């Protein structure tokens, strides 16, 4: 298509003198391979035919030199064709990852964490393999098909018209085949991954499948896809089965016509009988190279859709940027203020938040409450500027967030998101995200607080106990409990808890929420709280409700005034 060529011209430009060297090396190698029949014909007509026996043994040296050049010009070509393709893939992968790392939460969520990994890992490999078997297999045809004709002119111009008749007809008969094979091949490719995703969904949700007794219809829906894939494969194979026999038939018919029209000339003496072997080998090599090059031509669209995805990833411009010359407040102390903020997610006609306005002074705890979907997590993200408020103000320590060093805001914001993610490695490595240089006496204290000490201390490896790819070895309530520890080890000026207290039994939840209420005695803490009994000690309470705030105050004042807070208290009374 169009995006693919753009990619190429941008990301193979650093390797032009390697492509230009491969193109020359494979020209020399192909010419050497085609020249062996020429010197064989020279042996036949200047040797055996004339009776000279020393001419054959002296042309054997030329043959040996040609075949010695042909191997070095091929092993030098495969070296540079690899050094160029791997470099191109490496550069493309680095560029894609660098562009992705600049995305904010919204841009990253638009594509999805799973889809971006495929974009940066498999759709770059597809273009890399296209490059490799283009620089090593596609271009074999334009030099073979041209040099063969050139050598035919150099040998016997009066009969070379056979190469100008047979090569175009084979090319046309193969193009007509591939132009029909390509769409069904793409359909088969789009069915293979469909059945793969069907199997993946069946295996992932096996408990769900068995709990709903959907096996009898799951079998039907898998069979109706397997049969469709088989039918598409048969349709694509009944076209592919014509590629080789047609080429062989063309080669053999060309050989027969060559022998006939060559005997016609040799009887008249216009050509020596030795050139028949050379022409036979020319036909075989040229028409084999053409077919082998058209074999790779099937997957252009497969590498074109991948290039389109990569280009759409690379064309997205991040919105949340770092302001030029940001104000640098030394020793940033947590003091938050939200003035008439509103987010209004892309996908508008309903702003998630509207006219939100409150203040959290330093060392005071503010707890936000609201029903599911109210926008508490959106408010938390806005506080740390994962997103940006569209028509409001959000100022930490007086200065607006929008004009402030984003890394300095990152360094002292103590975020514990709702999700909960633990990176691969050891528990100590995960806890080192907060403080890069943390002692074991400090890690155990930070660990201890989150009440997570006595499930890793009972491990044989202690602090170095392994962690899965995404903390999947944990059960939930241990992963998001370690998430609390990795942020409490930071000792930040701001804590931002996003309801990581779920999946915890009563005793552990109480222990954690009482222990972290002590270490955060002097710190700006914003906690997404759900249990009203855990909000009495909070200095301020915010009453988000499906959009804006519907109440601000302490426990008693909000119970007296706010009716939704009263509803929450009544409903979780007993």
């Amino acid at each position: 298509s169009n995006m693919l060529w753009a990619l190429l011209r941008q990301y193979v430009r650093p390797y032009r003198w390697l492509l230009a060297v491969v193109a020359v090396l494979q020209v020399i190698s192909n010419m050497a391979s085609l020249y062996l029949p020429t010197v064989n014909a020279a042996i036949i007509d200047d040797g055996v035919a004339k009776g000279d026996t020393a001419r054959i043994v002296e042309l054997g040296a030329v043959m040996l030199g040609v075949t010695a050049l042909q191997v070095v010009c091929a092993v030098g070509a495969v070296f540079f064709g690899a050094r160029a393709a791997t470099g191109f893939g490496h550069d493309l992968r680095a560029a894609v990852f660098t562009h992705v790392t600049t995305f904010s939460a919204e841009e990253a969520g638009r594509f999805g964490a799973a889809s971006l990994l495929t974009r940066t890992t498999n759709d770059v490999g597809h273009i890399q393999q296209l490059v490799q078997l283009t620089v090593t297999m596609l271009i074999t045809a334009p030099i073979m098909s041209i040099g063969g004709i050139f050598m035919a002119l150099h040998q016997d111009a009066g009969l070379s018209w056979l190469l100008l008749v047979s090569v175009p007809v084979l090319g046309l008969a193969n193009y007509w085949i591939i132009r029909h094979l390509m769409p069904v091949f793409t359909r088969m490719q789009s069915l293979i991954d469909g059945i793969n995703r069907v199997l993946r969904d069946q295996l992932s949700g096996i408990r769900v499948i068995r709990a709903f007794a959907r096996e009898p219809l799951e079998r039907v829906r898998f069979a109706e896809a397997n049969q469709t894939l088989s039918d598409s494969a048969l349709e694509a194979g009944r076209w592919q089965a014509l590629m080789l026999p047609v080429t062989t038939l063309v080669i053999n018919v060309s050989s027969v016509a060559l022998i006939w029209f060559g005997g016609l000339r040799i009887d008249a003496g216009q050509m020596q009988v030795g050139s028949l072997i050379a022409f036979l080998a020319y036909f075989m090599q040229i028409l084999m190279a053409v077919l082998m090059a058209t074999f790779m031509l099937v997957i252009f669209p497969r590498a074109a859709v991948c290039a389109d995805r990569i280009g759409e990833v690379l064309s997205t411009q991040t919105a949340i940027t770092n302001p030029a010359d940001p104000v640098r407040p030394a020793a940033i102390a947590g003091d938050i203020g939200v003035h008439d903020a509103t987010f209004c997610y892309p996908g508008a006609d309903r702003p998630v938040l509207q006219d939100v306005s409150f203040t959290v002074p330093r060392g005071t705890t503010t707890a936000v409450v609201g029903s599911t979907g109210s926008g508490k997590s959106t408010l938390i993200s806005l506080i740390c500027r994962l997103y940006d408020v569209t028509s409001g103000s959000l100022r930490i320590d007086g200065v607006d967030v929008r004009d402030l060093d984003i890394e300095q805001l990152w360094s002292a914001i103590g975020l514990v998101p709702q999700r909960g993610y633990l990176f691969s490695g050891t528990v100590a490595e995960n806890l080192r995200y907060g403080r890069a240089d943390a002692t074991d006496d400090e890690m155990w204290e930070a660990l201890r607080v989150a009440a997570a000490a006595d499930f890793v201390r009972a491990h044989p490896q202690g602090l170095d106990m392994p962690v899965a790819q995404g903390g999947i070895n944990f059960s939930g309530g241990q992963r998001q409990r370690l998430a609390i520890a990795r942020a409490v080890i930071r000792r930040p000026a701001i804590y931002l808890f996003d309801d990581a207290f779920s999946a915890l039994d009563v005793h552990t939840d109480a222990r954690v929420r009482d222990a972290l209420r002590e270490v955060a005695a002097d710190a700006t803490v914003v906690i997404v709280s759900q249990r009203i009994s855990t909000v009495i000690e909070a200095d301020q309470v915010v009453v988000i409700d499906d959009g804006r705030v519907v109440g601000i105050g302490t426990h008693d004042t909000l119970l007296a005034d706010c009716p939704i807070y009263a509803e929450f208290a009544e409903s979780q009374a007993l």
Binding site: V48, G87, L117, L264, D267, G373, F423, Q530
Partner: protein
């Protein structure tokens, strides 16, 4: 191009025999493929001999025209020898020339006609062979995938836990493709290639054994070079694959935990680690693929050396009169054809080993012991009275989980199970669904036992709500309709409204067409649980069990859900498991359970009366410690 490093097979030949027997039904089709291949290869190898005879006739006529007429061959040779050019006389000696006569074009034409007819038949048989081979391969693959499916649906629920994070996934998706490639190759390319070698060797033996020696000596040399290249590149393929997997894991961790990386200031460290890992994988890929691509030129060099030797020695022989010129043209074509399979013998070996080792894994999966055969009884739960009788269960032999408990769920009553983490609540309700088998107890639903009941008919009337919510990569409407696929677009929306999904559906741009995945789409976990609740309530159950259904849902929307479903779950029992004390309230039969046993039971008032466990728990839940 093959790049799979290697695999170890427990028994190569037994697995190969089993894989061959897999395609046993197509015995007639396989035999037809083999015979067509043999016929086509014979006709394709006999043609160059006909072309050699044609050019031999051309040569005889051309160089017999110049000789004086009248004289016969054996005296013309003597006359040429007496002329001093003895080598030309030797050339004339081994020939079929009649002096004074030119080329007979009629014989040449009627020989080329036979050659053309044979080539037409050869080029017509190969296409039919390939078309039949495609059908055979597709039929066998369809059968294998269907039986793999069946085995997957028959496997025990404990096999998927022992297997390590995607082993089963990579055993059926990308492991059957290797079998397909190996099967479609071992009868389409390897067979032709060995038959090509055999037929070519036969024909060149009929032409000249001495020339056959020079071109058969290269097979050991080419094989030695090929296996040396593969042996030296074996440490490279493993390194490339390991580095690729490591880079993919790092990229997945960076993308999934992107918020943590950005927030904790590790973006510039993740970028550095990527810049140090991608550089390593580039080297390990370039080095692994240079050697992989070095195979073809290496064997082509040996083939060209054989070609040079054959050409020189054949020219010497023909100039001496040992063999005819057409016989050396045919030999040149034969050696050119014979050199071909030696180039990708490495390819067939690699794609055969990688794929026989895959068939071994697939057969091992298909040979695992499955679930016990469920007795067809068509469970008839009317009221929903559940009873546990001395139920004991252990996930593995040894350490037990559930130890001799007995609960009685009366019809209509809503039993609520509470306890600390790791008590086994989820296990307790999984035993009710026959996910696992009770060791030394008995579960009775409405009097009848649960073992002598059709497992599907039992699980189709419980409508269980998971603890760890799962949604497939589809739309919200599809996820809700996943319960009953045969429900019109008026009950799915009613269930969504009952579960209050249609309260935040009206917030998204495209409400019911929103593509949602299990890895954090535009839907939060609390809203995600509502989709599961709606899906479970759409497929009308007879007794509900909800394991942490509303863990992430506030205690103001769950009250609305309870009020909306009060009529649905009015005469149906319900086992509610929740760590939140405000959900089990107004629900009789509260079971406090610890370490797999049940400490105490009764309603809320009775439990509060006898201070202990529950009491202490409810004091801890509220203000206190």
């Amino acid at each position: 191009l093959p790049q799979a490093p290697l695999e170890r097979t427990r028994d190569f030949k037994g697995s190969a025999i089993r894989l061959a027997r897999r395609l046993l039904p197509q015995r007639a089709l396989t035999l037809a493929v083999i015979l067509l291949g043999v016929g086509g290869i014979a006709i394709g190898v006999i043609g160059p001999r006909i072309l050699g005879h044609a050019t031999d006739l051309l040569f005889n006529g051309v160089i017999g025209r110049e000789l004086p007429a009248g004289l016969t061959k054996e005296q013309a040779v003597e006359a040429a020898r007496a002329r001093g050019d003895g080598t030309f006389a030797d050339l004339l000696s081994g020939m079929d020339i009649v002096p004074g006569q030119g080329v007979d074009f009629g014989a040449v034409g009627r020989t080329l006609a036979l050659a053309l007819g044979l080539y037409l038949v050869a080029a017509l048989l190969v296409w039919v062979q390939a078309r039949l081979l495609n059908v055979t391969v597709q039929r066998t693959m369809v059968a294998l995938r269907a039986e793999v499916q069946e085995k997957i649906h028959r496997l025990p629920l404990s096999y998927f836990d022992s297997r390590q994070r995607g082993e089963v996934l990579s055993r059926v998706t990308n492991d059957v493709d290797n079998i397909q490639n190996s099967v479609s190759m071992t009868i389409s390319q390897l067979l032709t290639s060995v038959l090509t070698v055999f037929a070519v060797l036969v024909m060149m033996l009929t032409i000249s054994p001495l020339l056959t020696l020079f071109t058969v000596v290269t097979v050991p040399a080419s094989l030695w070079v090929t296996r040396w290249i593969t042996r030296r590149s074996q440490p490279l393929f493993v390194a490339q694959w390991r580095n690729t997997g490591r880079l993919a894991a790092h990229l997945e961790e960076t993308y999934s935990g992107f918020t943590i990386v950005k927030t904790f200031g590790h973006r510039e460290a993740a970028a550095g680690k990527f810049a140090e890992l991608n550089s390593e994988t580039q080297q390990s890929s370039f080095g692994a693929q240079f050697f992989s691509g070095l195979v073809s030129p290496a064997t082509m060099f040996i083939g060209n050396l054989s070609y040079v030797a054959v050409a020189v020695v054949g020219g010497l022989q023909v100039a001496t009169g040992q063999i005819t010129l057409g016989s050396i043209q045919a030999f040149i074509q034969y050696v050119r054809q014979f050199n071909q399979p030696l180039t990708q013998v490495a390819g067939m070996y690699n794609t055969l080993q990688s794929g026989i080792a895959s068939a071994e894994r697939v057969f091992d999966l298909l040979d695992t012991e499955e679930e016990s055969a469920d007795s067809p009884r068509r469970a008839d739960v009317r009221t929903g009275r559940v009873e546990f009788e001395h139920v004991s269960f252990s996930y593995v032999p040894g350490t037990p989980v559930i130890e001799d408990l007995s609960l009685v769920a009366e019809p209509g009553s809503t039993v609520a199970i509470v306890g600390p983490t790791g008590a086994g609540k989820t296990t307790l309700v999984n035993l009710l669904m026959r996910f696992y088998d009770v060791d030394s107890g008995r579960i009775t639903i409405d009097g009848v036992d649960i073992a002598s009941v059709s497992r599907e008919s039992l699980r189709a009337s419980i409508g269980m709500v998971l603890q760890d919510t799962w949604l497939f990569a589809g739309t919200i409407y599809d996820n809700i309709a996943y319960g009953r696929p045969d429900a019109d677009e008026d009950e799915v929306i009613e269930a969504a409204t009952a579960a209050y999904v249609d309260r935040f559906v009206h917030t998204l741009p495209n409400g019911y067409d929103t593509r949602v995945d299990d890895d954090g789409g535009a839907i939060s976990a609390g809203e995600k649980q509502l989709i599961t609740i709606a899906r479970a309530v759409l497929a009308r159950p007879k007794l509900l069990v909800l394991d942490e259904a509303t863990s992430s849902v506030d205690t103001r929307t769950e009250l609305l859900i309870a009020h909306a479903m009060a009529e649905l779950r009015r005469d149906r029992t319900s086992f509610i498991i929740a760590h939140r004390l405000s959900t089990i309230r107004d629900a009789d039969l509260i079971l406090v359970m610890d370490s797999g046993r049940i400490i105490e039971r009764g309603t809320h008032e009775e439990l509060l009366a006898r201070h202990g466990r529950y009491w202490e728990m409810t004091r801890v839940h509220l203000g206190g410690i």
